[PDB]
Amino acid sequence: SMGVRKLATIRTAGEITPIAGAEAIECCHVDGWTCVIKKGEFKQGDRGVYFEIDSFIKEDNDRYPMLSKQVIDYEGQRGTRLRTARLRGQLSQGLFLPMDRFPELASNQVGDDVTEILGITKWEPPISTNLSGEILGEFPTFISKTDQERVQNLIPQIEENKGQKFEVTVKLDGSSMTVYRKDDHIGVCGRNWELRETATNAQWHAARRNKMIEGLQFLNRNLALQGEIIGESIQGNLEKLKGQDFYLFDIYDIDKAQYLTPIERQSLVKQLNDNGFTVKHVPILDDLELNHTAEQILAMADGPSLNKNVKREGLVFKRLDGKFSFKAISNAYLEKHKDR
Ligand SMILES: *P(=O)(O)OC[C@H]1O[C@@H](n2cnc3c(N)ncnc32)[C@H](O)[C@@H]1O
C-alpha cells in the first residue's frame, strides 16, 4: 500500500518511438507509461513534468492550451480530467510537458513531487449512495488505509523484486471497507471515515450480514479486516451481484502496525470459516514468481473477474512477506469504462 498520490512528478523521457502514419506526434515512454507527445518535444533523457491519469488540471490556456477543449466543471472549479486515450492507435496516458514550461521548478531534481506547487488535484468517480453515512470519527490513525501504488510507477522496484513470490488477487470495483477491533471498541469504516450504524448504511449491513464483528470478538485480537464492498448500486455493479457483500483482501495487525502475510491471512480466514463466520475473500489466483517487466505485468491484468463472464478491473500483487504490494489496472477496462 502507499503514501500521497504524486500526481505530478519530474520524470525522464525513456524510449521515443514513432507512431506509424502520424508524422506530427510520437510515443514517449515515461517509466511504465506511454504518453503521446508532439514530434521533437522531447528526446530520450529529457526531464519533464508528468501528470498522471486522474489528475485534474485547472483551466489555464497559457500553460495548458492542449487541455482547452476538455474543460469541465468539477467540484466547483473549471479544469480537465486526464484519462486514458488511444491516439492513431497508440495508448496514451498522462501529460508530459518539458521543464522549460515551469520556470518555478528551476531548482528541482528528477523525482520530485510537484503536485502541490502546481495545484494539481485528484479526480474520482462519484461515490455510491449508502456508502456515505453518518460519521463517527476519523479513519483510525492506528490502521493503514488501503491505497496501492501502480506498477507503471515501480519500474526499479519490480526489477529489485525479481524472484520474490506474490499473492495475486482479482481487483474488485467497489468501495474500501474496514471493520476493526481495538480493545473495547469495534468499528466499521469506509474509505476515509469511521461510520455510525444506521438501518441504511451499506458497510454496517455487510458487516452484520457476514458476522465479521462476531468473528473479531471470537479472535479476541486487535485486527482490522480490510476488503471491498461490491454489488448492487456500487460503482455500476460490474459483478452483477444481487445485494451487496464484503470481500476481504487484507488484515492489519493493529498492535504490530503491520499487515498479516498472505499465508497468515489465509489461516485466519480458514479459522473464521471453521467457527461459522463466513467472510468472503477476493478471488485468489496462482501465486506469481516475479520475473517480469511492467508491460508483462500489465498484460496479465485483463481477464475474468469474480463473475467469470465479466472483464476485471485488474489485479493486486501482494508479496508473501506482506510488506510490498502494487496494483496493475487493466487498460482494456479503462478503455471500456470511460468513467474510470
Ligand atoms: P483501485 O485503483 O481502487 O486501488 C486500490 C483499491 O482497490 C481495492 N481493492 C479491490 N480489490 C482489491 C484486492 N484484490 N486487493 C487489494 N485492494 C483491492 C481497495 O479498495 C484499494 O483501496
Distance 34 CA to ligand 1 centre (A): 23
CA dihedral 209, 213, 218, 219 (to 10 degrees): 120
CA dihedral 90, 94, 100, 105 (to 10 degrees): -160
> Is 256 marked as a binding-site residue?
no
Distance 24 CA to ligand 1 centre (A): 38
Q: Which of 282, 297, 331 is the last residue of a domain?
A: 282
Distance CA 331, CA 301 (A): 8
Q: Are residues 334 and 204 in the same domain?
A: no
Distance CA 104, CA 293 (A): 35
Distance CA 146, CA 163 (A): 25
User: Is the shortest distance between the CB of 150 and ligand 1 below 6 Å?
Assistant: no
> DSSP assignment, residue 219?
H
- Helical ranges in the chain per DSSP H: 115-118, 155-160, 202-209, 212-219, 262-274, 294-301, 331-336
Q: Are residues 339 and 307 in the same domain?
A: yes
Residue 205 lies in a domain: yes
Q: Which atom of ligand 1 is the closest one to the Cα of 171?
A: 11
Solved with: X-ray
User: Is the shortest distance between the CB of 176 and ligand 1 below 6 Å?
Assistant: yes
For residues 93 and 84, is the Cβ–Cβ distance under 8 A? Answer: yes
For residues 338 and 196, is the Cβ–Cβ distance under 8 A? Answer: no
Beta 185-189 vs 85-87: how paired, if at all? unpaired
Q: What is the DSSP string of 274-335?
A: HTT---EE--B---EE----HHHHHHHH-SB-SSTTSB-SEEEEEETTSS-EEEEE-HHHHH
Resolution (A): 1.7
Distance CA 210, CA 191 (A): 19
User: Is the shortest distance between the CB of 282 and ligand 1 below 6 Å?
Assistant: yes
Amino acid at residue number 244: Q
Q: Are residues 141 and 259 in the same domain?
A: yes
For residues 303 and 290, is the Cβ–Cβ distance under 8 A? Answer: no
The residues near 272 (Cβ < 8 Å, ≥ 6 apart) are: 212, 215, 218, 219, 278, 279
Residue 198 lies in a domain: yes
> Is 170 marked as a binding-site residue?
yes
Residue 129 gets the label, from left (phi > 0), alpha (psi -120 to 50) or beta, of alpha
For residues 224 and 178, is the Cβ–Cβ distance under 8 A? Answer: yes
Q: Are residues 112 and 136 in the same domain?
A: no
Distance CA 200, CA 46 (A): 54
Amino acid at residue number 48: G
Q: Are residues 135 and 113 in the same domain?
A: no
Beta 185-189 vs 258-259: how paired, if at all? unpaired
User: Is the shortest distance between the CB of 147 and ligand 1 below 6 Å?
Assistant: yes
Q: How many CB atoms lie within 10 A of CB 301?
A: 22
Amino acid at residue number 81: R
The residue assigned the cell 486514458 is 84
Q: Are residues 69 and 88 in the same domain?
A: yes
Residue 162's beta-bridge partner residues?
A: none
**Cα angle vertex 154, ends 147, 146, to 5°?**
10
Residue 170's beta-bridge partner residues?
A: 315
User: Is the shortest distance between the CB of 173 and ligand 1 below 6 Å?
Assistant: no
Secondary element (H or E) of residue 178:
strand 175-182
Our count of domains for the chain comes to: 3
Distance 112 CA to ligand 1 centre (A): 26
Beta 280-281 vs 244-253: how paired, if at all? parallel
User: Is the shortest distance between the CB of 154 and ligand 1 below 6 Å?
Assistant: no
Distance CA 278, CA 271 (A): 10
Q: Are residues 299 and 193 in the same domain?
A: no
> Is 228 marked as a binding-site residue?
yes
Domain of residue 320, residue span: 147-173+283-340
> Is 169 marked as a binding-site residue?
yes
Please give the distance of CA 24 from its chain centroid, rounded to a whole number.
33
**How far apart, in Å, are the Cα atoms of 47 and each of 97, 108, 310?**
9, 11, 40
User: Is the shortest distance between the CB of 172 and ligand 1 below 6 Å?
Assistant: yes
User: Is the shortest distance between the CB of 171 and ligand 1 below 6 Å?
Assistant: yes
Distance CA 201, CA 133 (A): 6
Task: Pick from 124, 173, 176 the residue to mutate for probing ligand 1's pocket: most ligand atoms within 8 Å of its CB.
Answer: 176
Distance CA 166, CA 143 (A): 23
Distance CA 29, CA 137 (A): 43
For residues 26 and 36, is the Cβ–Cβ distance under 8 A? Answer: yes
The residue assigned the cell 530520450 is 44
Q: Are residues 329 and 242 in the same domain?
A: no
Residue 62 lies in a domain: yes
Distance CA 50, CA 6 (A): 10
Residue 90 lies in a domain: yes
Distance CA 38, CA 52 (A): 18
